[PDB]
Amino acid sequence: SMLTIVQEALTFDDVLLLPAYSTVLPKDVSLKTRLTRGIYLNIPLVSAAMDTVTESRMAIAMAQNGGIGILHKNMDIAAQAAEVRRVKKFEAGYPNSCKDDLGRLRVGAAVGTGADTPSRVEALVEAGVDVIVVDTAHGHSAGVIERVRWVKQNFPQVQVIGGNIATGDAALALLDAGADAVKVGIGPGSICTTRIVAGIGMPQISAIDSVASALKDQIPLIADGGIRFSGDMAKAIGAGASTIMVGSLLAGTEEAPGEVEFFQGRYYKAYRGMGSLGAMALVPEGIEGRVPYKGPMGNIVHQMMGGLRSSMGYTGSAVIEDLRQNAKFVKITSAG
Amino acid sequence: SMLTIVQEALTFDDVLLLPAYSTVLPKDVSLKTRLTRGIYLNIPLVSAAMDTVTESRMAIAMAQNGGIGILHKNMDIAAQAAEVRRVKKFEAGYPNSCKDDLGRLRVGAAVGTGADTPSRVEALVEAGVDVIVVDTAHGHSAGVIERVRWVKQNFPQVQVIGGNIATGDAALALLDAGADAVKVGIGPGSICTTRIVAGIGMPQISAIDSVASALKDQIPLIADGGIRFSGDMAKAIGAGASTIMVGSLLAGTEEAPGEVEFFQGRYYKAYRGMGSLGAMAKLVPEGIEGRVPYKGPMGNIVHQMMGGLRSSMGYTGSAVIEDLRQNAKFVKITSAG
Amino acid sequence: SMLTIVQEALTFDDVLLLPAYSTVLPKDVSLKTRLTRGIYLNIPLVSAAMDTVTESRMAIAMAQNGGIGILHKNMDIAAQAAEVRRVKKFEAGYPNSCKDDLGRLRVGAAVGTGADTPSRVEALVEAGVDVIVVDTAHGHSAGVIERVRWVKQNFPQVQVIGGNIATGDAALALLDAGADAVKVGIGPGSICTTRIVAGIGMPQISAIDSVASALKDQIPLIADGGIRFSGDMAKAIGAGASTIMVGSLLAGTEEAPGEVEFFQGRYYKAYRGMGSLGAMALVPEGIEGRVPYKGPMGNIVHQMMGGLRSSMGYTGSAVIEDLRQNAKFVKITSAG
Amino acid sequence: SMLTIVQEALTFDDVLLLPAYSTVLPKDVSLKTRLTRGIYLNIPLVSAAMDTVTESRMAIAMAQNGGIGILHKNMDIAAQAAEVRRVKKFEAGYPNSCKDDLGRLRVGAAVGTGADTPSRVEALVEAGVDVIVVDTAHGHSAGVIERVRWVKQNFPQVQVIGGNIATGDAALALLDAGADAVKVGIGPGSICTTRIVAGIGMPQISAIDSVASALKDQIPLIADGGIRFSGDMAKAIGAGASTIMVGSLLAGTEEAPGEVEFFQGRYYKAYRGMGSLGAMALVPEGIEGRVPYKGPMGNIVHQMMGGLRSSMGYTGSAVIEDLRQNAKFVKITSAG
Amino acid sequence: SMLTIVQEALTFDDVLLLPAYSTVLPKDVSLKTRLTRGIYLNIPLVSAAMDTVTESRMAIAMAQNGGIGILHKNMDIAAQAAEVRRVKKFEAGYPNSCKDDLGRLRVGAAVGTGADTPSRVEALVEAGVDVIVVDTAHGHSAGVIERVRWVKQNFPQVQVIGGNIATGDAALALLDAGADAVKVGIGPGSICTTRIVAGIGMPQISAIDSVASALKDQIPLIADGGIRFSGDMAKAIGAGASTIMVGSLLAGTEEAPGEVEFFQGRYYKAYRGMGSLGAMALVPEGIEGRVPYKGPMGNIVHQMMGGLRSSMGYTGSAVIEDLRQNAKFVKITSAG
């Protein structure tokens, strides 16, 4: 047989974490973790670089709650550089705030690889951005690898993240490029149609496992796409993630961009893939639609972290590294 | 690959018991078994320690029918001790009744690990409870292990169960602590959202097998949560269970707590996990609250449950519960079947 | 680990027959096969011993079309013996008719193991029944094995079948009892709830395989329960079956027992398990209900046999026995 | 124990392609490939030989877009031969046209094995057809193997395809018969009840692999049936196909045969299997019914080829053969 | 009692036309009628002065088919004057065309009562408009009366219409002002919410009779709004109308303004009242919505006039004026 089947790949619904001996209470566990090898967060949450999820308003909310938001790149360099500054300059009237050495809220910005990326990077770095995200659909490519190298070579004073990838090989490639972190996710996202359009994908749990196993903790990985519930977060971290990037979960919140729309007595906001027709206005690889209005994103964050605190209670994980190194899984069937 | 997959875990719908050579008729099989290493029931059914399932009215029905109820702890100590006493001195105007040495209907009572636990245990024992159920979400913990050891040390004249657990390891920890049985079930219950909130769980068939395998019959286990049909009970016992705890199947019956509410024709009672907002009214909820259809007297339900179980031991050639535990053969089925 | 899992058992929907090199067209295959080591049929179809499926009227249709029917036992001894004579003496004004040496339509009759069985067997044999079916829920029992032995010792001039079973061990036991065939099926039937009531069952393809492998063709097996389309018959036979018993597919035909009822514009007939509340009036192990009225069973038989001919075309099977010995399967997943 | 399970066969939904290192952009990949060992196409798309998909007008659109249509055979020899000419002589007032040495659009025609096949084949060859498709439900049969030899020996100047098949063995047989390509697909078609009627089938990824592996590139194979999305086409090619035949995706376009019917405010065309009752007027092996009207096929082709270029981008395949040789898959579960 | 109930008032569904002695066939009926006292049409159909119904393209189709369209006033003077010209300067490669003395396609245009109306009338008259429609919600107003007196006194070479109105008193006020016709209809429009918002309205049949009894044929009236079926045209004319104005029946046609949208496999266009939020950006007095795409307007126009012919055949009406003069009605209940 010539068919090369590399493994049976697993998503979130395929596995459960096993409870284990435990002395720590959910309320006492530590959620602190690494976004990059130089940036730490207080909760392992990143808002997605999407024009329906993260602009300055959301990014400020993320930082205030311990995480970080990745400003999207569907805007000209000036507007995006200005968004960075709104975050960097914001002043409150938040004990877990995520902050740089100068005590400013941390923020991040997506870039591409096209001909505007040198100017965009420069502007964002001068605006004080903490991490550049080279944010593409296929990170295991010569263009993303060399653009990651260029940012490290030419702006070594800022952290750089590359993606997206889904194999040990790609992760090893971006690591040698100089990346401070890789972002993991090809196919898992809620608004993704790559699986249908290109037949391309890697179940996220097996994806996380592949990248983490190859990286050997030299740099953190962000598990990006497909998180639907707090449980998914613990499975991801237990599979080896250091942080989790979420789009749908924060779409429709107060702080997300877009106007609340009234439709048949309910309240909605728009949520669309960056690869959707409307986003790009290359065959589309994403859908666009409405998600219910969710109110303040704070409630969502506290709920998701309560869930993860509960999980590290069952696993006996006093800090994030314990979940990463010690979780045990079982594989469940369709019935389960 | 750093991904530690311990096994493929099976729930109830993953397996079926094989029929085997048989000489015994469903009607002639014995359902007697042990709840703890010192307490025998006449049927292997235990009702759940939930404020929508077991108060004294339900515990008396359970005893009268050959099993036992575990009174829930969602009430102050005075109220729980009175519940024990109602069941313990209940007198009938029931040839299978489950009774202590003094001929009194048996009853159990749940406690937690909070600082009220010493007074609660003392009052429940003083009132004549037959078994203390140290009842938590995660029994493989120091608080529950040390609380199980403290009950055995300080009140050796009452039986103690620990849980909930789902691994051989946690069963050995509780066995070492003095437990007279363990309660198995992390995630399987009908009102359990723990799978979604924490990503935590162990399919119940594999859970039972893992616990039973480690214990080697030193103490029994109670299979708790996820029972939907009489067939589930046969599988549980075949996988190594000694008894079966149920909440959903007895919720909504006449004897379960709560009022019958009318609503668009049908009649209902409430049913909710002890991890629901409503029950706990801080940990985020780990269960749901809702209505279940009113079912009428619990006895009819128990009789159908045990009739189905009698059907199964007929098919398996099991004349007593222990035959089913030791001799059951399984097959794994797919999603199609 | 103490859990004894004997195998992953397969049902019809888990497997597909593989086409193979072929020289005989579907129109040219032979459907002839053996009910018992004594009785041959011209098609491998047996109608179910159910009070909504098989009384004399349907038993005659089965025989005329080359098969045979098993009259149910939910009637007194005199009524069942009269049903037998009705078939045995029927006269038409059917080239594939299934017939004994004297040219009479063949027929069969179900009995149990209760106190009445000696009388019942005796009346049936004197009425000319071709085969006795010791018809129980659990053939791997002392009662059924001994009753089968007693029918064979005391009425060696009629053929006897025992069931139902689902393992090699049980098939061996009935073989040594003197059974001239065994009937395979614990769980598969359309109206069965035993899997829900007792947690008991053998996926039918694996059941057939386990019985057929144990027997090594010493006696035929009847694959009883779970047949939904003609394709299932091809898999049962390829798995090892010599005949196929069906209830659901023939219920609601004109010849089946019962009246047609009018309901909301459709036309229905009753279909209920022999272990349902109504049929028995032991906790019930089957359901009661309606099935659409289907008209003359003759069209159903012809469509079923068409599909089996088509299947024997694809497999290069000129005779039933070629499908029995030569079928190759693939296992398939949920998606397919 | 006696059950022969050849393997767990996989369909499209069971597998995903893995992204790999990539230096080539979707817009720059080559879609060129072989239809037969002698005819090359510019895109790997073939329209199905069905009386609801391919007549001259659709066959011209296929060629015009770089592919080829196989005119169906549910018409007399005279009408079919004129359909060939209408394609061969069509002149436009299309830089990827697929053409023969004389610059004429290429076309194919389906024939059967029945008694008219000699007359039909001669008229088609005489009309200038580029490829004869011996088009049956069961290509692993003496009838089709002999008829494919008869076309090669008697009309060496035309290419011959034989099908349908699902195994290496059948592929090797047609190869020996002289086929210039094999058509793979037993049971995968959208309108196919063969799985239900005859219990016969091979999941298409495993079908392709089995055939591809046995042929060792001595002749291409055409993956025929079950294609629902462009993602499917990438999986088929990665599994080893050289082209893709589609019926459902092109049914309902303006160029497919048939009138547009208005029904309840929607616009439909008819789509039906060639084994359906309405087509044949043997038990039916397919259904008839409506498919939404889709407008001009060109948009569908473009959409489909764009998805495949995206896939070859993700996999680092610069030309079709790169995908065929270097594709890696993961198997995924029902949850996935 | 003090409540003043002028009458029980009838809409179209409250009445039926009685058949009468007839010596004429639908095919031989004449549909010619007057739009004003000076302009005649060949069919009694006027398209609605709405930004979702009538612009130049539709006004041309209206004229080509023997009717007239009124260009809406949701555009600056320059744009409306251009629209007129485009109609007045049209030529085709339509023997019932509606044409002025110069063989020009007739056309009409709507104006208001406020500031720009002097400049607007002038631009429109000088571009060759055949009729000016002083087009307001409430025509029984000093504003409308004097503006219609102004257009007559200052542009006696153009025909003028005033409306909308629903009573004889209102029609006499506009007759005395100089009107060449009046448009009748307060509340009957399909997108009208005036009945709900203001409580204001007049059932269209009774409005037509009230106005026609006052005018005594001195000028014709246009029955505007409420028309759903061709049968409503006959009743309107029978109750006294000389022409019918329609919005919704013509919206969604190819020739109407706006682009066709796709929404769940169906095709639509926009249709909205001129008193809806969108048209206006006063509390809105009309709704906004989609109507199904209807294809060419010619099919609708012809089917409509087909029905009207059928009616005049039933009624013995060889010309429009017989229907108007001789029609008898019965009142029917909710039952009928």
Ligand SMILES: C[C@@H](Oc1ccc2ncc3c(c2c1)CCOC3)c1cncc(-c2nc(Cl)c[nH]2)c1
């Ligand atoms: C159409 C648009 O689609 C997106 C956009 C953003 C994405 N962001 C993240 C992910 C995916 C995305 C897909 C899909 C894979 O999973 C993660 C797109 C944009 N630019 C490049 C590609 C592409 N290049 C190769 Cl090569 C193949 N196609 C796709």
Ligand SMILES: C[C@@H](Oc1ccc2ncc3c(c2c1)CCOC3)c1cncc(-c2nc(Cl)c[nH]2)c1
């Ligand atoms: C919110 C509430 O939820 C329940 C309540 C009762 C339960 N009873 C039985 C079971 C479960 C239960 C969950 C879930 C596991 O399966 C069995 C809860 C109450 N106190 C502790 C926990 C907890 N501690 C760790 Cl550590 C992690 N979370 C959860």
Ligand SMILES: C[C@@H](Oc1ccc2ncc3c(c2c1)CCOC3)c1cncc(-c2nc(Cl)c[nH]2)c1
């Ligand atoms: C209630 C009634 O149920 C039926 C009836 C007919 C059946 N006929 C065929 C099959 C089954 C049937 C079950 C179930 C298994 O599949 C085949 C019944 C009747 N008498 C005996 C039993 C029985 N004895 C053991 Cl021991 C366990 N229960 C069950």
Ligand SMILES: C[C@@H](Oc1ccc2ncc3c(c2c1)CCOC3)c1cncc(-c2nc(Cl)c[nH]2)c1
């Ligand atoms: C009824 C009709 O059904 C079709 C027609 C066209 C098909 N075209 C392609 C495919 C299939 C088709 C089935 C089914 C297998 O998948 C591919 C048919 C036509 N002639 C032969 C057969 C046949 N011969 C053997 Cl032997 C078994 N049955 C079936």
Ligand SMILES: C[C@@H](Oc1ccc2ncc3c(c2c1)CCOC3)c1cncc(-c2nc(Cl)c[nH]2)c1
């Ligand atoms: C909001 C807008 O609404 C319309 C627009 C166009 C209409 N065209 C025709 C008809 C109606 C219309 C209503 C309603 C009456 O029936 C026919 C409007 C615009 N300017 C004036 C009025 C008005 N003035 C008085 Cl006084 C009372 N409200 C209403």
Ligand SMILES: O=c1[nH]cnc2c1ncn2[C@@H]1O[C@H](COP(=O)(O)O)[C@@H](O)[C@H]1O
């Ligand atoms: O159009 C798109 N197609 C596919 N993936 C996308 C697209 N846009 C964004 N993504 C990914 O989807 C993620 C959000 O996934 P979600 O949290 O499951 O909704 C983002 O972080 C991106 O990695």
Ligand SMILES: O=c1[nH]cnc2c1ncn2[C@@H]1O[C@H](COP(=O)(O)O)[C@@H](O)[C@H]1O
């Ligand atoms: O809120 C909750 N979350 C999870 N499990 C719960 C909760 N409350 C009770 N349980 C468990 O669920 C069991 C009842 O399961 P059931 O019989 O499937 O309804 C109880 O015996 C407990 O072990």
Ligand SMILES: O=c1[nH]cnc2c1ncn2[C@@H]1O[C@H](COP(=O)(O)O)[C@@H](O)[C@H]1O
């Ligand atoms: O009540 C019942 N329970 C289980 N099996 C039954 C019952 N009644 C009949 N059967 C079996 O079910 C078969 C019919 O299955 P079906 O053809 O799938 O409808 C019969 O031949 C019996 O073997």
Ligand SMILES: O=c1[nH]cnc2c1ncn2[C@@H]1O[C@H](COP(=O)(O)O)[C@@H](O)[C@H]1O
């Ligand atoms: O009636 C039929 N039964 C089974 N297969 C058929 C039938 N008619 C056509 N086919 C096959 O189905 C294919 C179309 O599959 P689709 O692209 O999934 O719609 C054709 O190319 C044929 O190979």
Ligand SMILES: O=c1[nH]cnc2c1ncn2[C@@H]1O[C@H](COP(=O)(O)O)[C@@H](O)[C@H]1O
């Ligand atoms: O917003 C509005 N409110 C009320 N009536 C309107 C509105 N827009 C247009 N109309 C009237 O409704 C007529 C069209 O009615 P229809 O033919 O029933 O759709 C137009 O000729 C106007 O007289």
